[PDB]
Amino acid sequence: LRRNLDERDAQTKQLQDAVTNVEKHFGELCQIFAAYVRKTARLRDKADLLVNEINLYASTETPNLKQGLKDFADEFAKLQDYRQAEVERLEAKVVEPLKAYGTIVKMKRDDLKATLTARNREAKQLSQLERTRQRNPSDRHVISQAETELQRATIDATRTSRHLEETIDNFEKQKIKDIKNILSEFITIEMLFHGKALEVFTAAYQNIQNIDE
Amino acid sequence: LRRNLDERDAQTKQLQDAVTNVEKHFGELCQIFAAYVRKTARLRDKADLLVNEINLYASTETPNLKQGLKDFADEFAKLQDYRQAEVERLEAKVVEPLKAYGTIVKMKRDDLKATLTARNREAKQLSQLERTRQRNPSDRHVISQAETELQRATIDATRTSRHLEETIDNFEKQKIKDIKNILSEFITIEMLFHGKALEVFTAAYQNIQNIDE
């Protein structure tokens, strides 16, 4: 029935738009997290430049001031190693899992296309059956054959749509697990870095106090 | 005496090179700290983009997942306000004090130039005195006048050099205080930010756990 076909299509469009919504927003988050990683690395570069200049300036100075400056530079350089570990973990645990949704989305689009193909085959077999009844009204045999082929197309379309509903449902379940895990990893990777920074800067504060002024 | 003038000049050259060494290295540190600040701000920009996308994606989602995402975005946005305070303090307490050494260096160069000028005047008055003795060997009056003017130039050069030694000595004392204070401020400003980040990310870890998966 026509009012049922409008409903059936609108419901598949929702599954289609559900895949698109994730493709769009996980993909945007993926680009932003990659840019966040690049900006973290570019900040590490400037911190390296500071380490080098403090060391070079320290090499020109009186002994106690030189030692205090080198000790600071040694601690701060340690912080940039932790920043490098933060960059690598963010690439592996945040950017790469979001990037993998390109392939997940492609597989869902195949399931959606198979459903559209099966429904076109069904609609074609239904129009075939009505035409065959009209051209050969009294040929029970060829009508029965067209009825049998419609029933095959119908159950194949139902089963293809039934599989689609299951894979999209699993896709939504895994979407929630993934976004929880991806943001959790981002939070713990950052927390690890900020905790190490506090350790480093606490010690660096001592090495500056020992500079005899 | 000539061996004394080589010594006297080499010692003023050391004062001159001491001003240059600070000009060069405080100026390099100033440029690097400014670039470090710009890279911190550019990392804040990317974090803002993450806040916006998480909010926009959350506006499309089921109620519990939407709320969990918005709560994360609200906490992380709080972290970028602390990053903005870190940027402002680094500009005011680290970059600006290093930048102020352009003016300090200029004043020391004036003291150095006054010393060179006074020594040229002295050397000229000494050559004048020897010439006057040679052209008027028996004019005790004009010789005595040239001797008196040499003694004025000599004590003026001694006093100008004596003032130079005092201002460079004070300049070295203040250099050590300043570099200790500037690096201490950098360390405490960073420590403050990393401590606030730990607070924010600890709370953000809860808001992610409440997402029903």
Numbering used by the authors:
A (entry chain A), B (entry chain A): 2 to 214
Reported in the publication:
FAM92A (family with sequence similarity 92A), a classical BAR protein, regulates ciliary assembly, mitochondrial ultrastructure, and neuronal membrane dynamics, yet its molecular mechanisms remain elusive. FAM92A (also known as BARMR1 or CIBAR1), first cloned from human testis, is a gene encoding a BAR domain–containing protein and belongs to the FAM92 (family with sequence similarity 92) family alongside FAM92B (CIBAR2). Mouse FAM92A possesses a central BAR domain (amino acids 70–283) flanked by unstructured regions at both the N and C termini. In ciliogenesis, FAM92A plays a critical role through its interaction with Chibby1 (CBY1).
In this study, employing biochemical and structural biology approaches, we demonstrated that the BAR domain of mouse FAM92A forms a dimer and resolved its crystal structure at 2.2 Å resolution. The structure was solved by molecular replacement, employing the AlphaFold2-predicted model as a search template. Each monomer consists of three extended α-helices connected by loops, featuring a characteristic kink in α2 (residues 160–170) induced by the conserved Pro167. Like other BAR domains, the FAM92A BAR domain adopts an antiparallel dimeric arrangement, with the two monomers oriented oppositely along their long axes, forming a symmetric, crescent-shaped structure stabilized by a crystallographic twofold rotation axis. This dimerization buries an extensive interface of ∼2700 Å2. The interface can be broadly divided into two distinct regions: interface 1, on the convex surface, involves antiparallel α3 helices, whereas interface 2, on the concave surface, comprises antiparallel α1 helices. The analysis reveals a distinct charge distribution: the concave surface is predominantly positively charged, whereas the convex surface exhibits a negative charge. The most intense positive potential is located centrally, contributed by positively charged residues (R108, K109, R112, R114, and K116) from the dimer-forming α1 helices (denoted as region 1). Consistent with previous studies and the established properties of BAR domains, a substantial fraction of WT FAM92A BAR is cosedimented with brain liposomes, confirming its membrane-binding capability. In line with our aforementioned analysis, mutating the residues in region 1 (R108, K109, R112, R114, and K116) reduced the amount of copelleted protein by approximately 90% compared with WT, underscoring the critical role of this central region in lipid binding. Mutating L120 to the negatively charged glutamic acid, together with I257 to the polar glutamine, abolished dimer formation, as shown by SEC–MALS analysis.
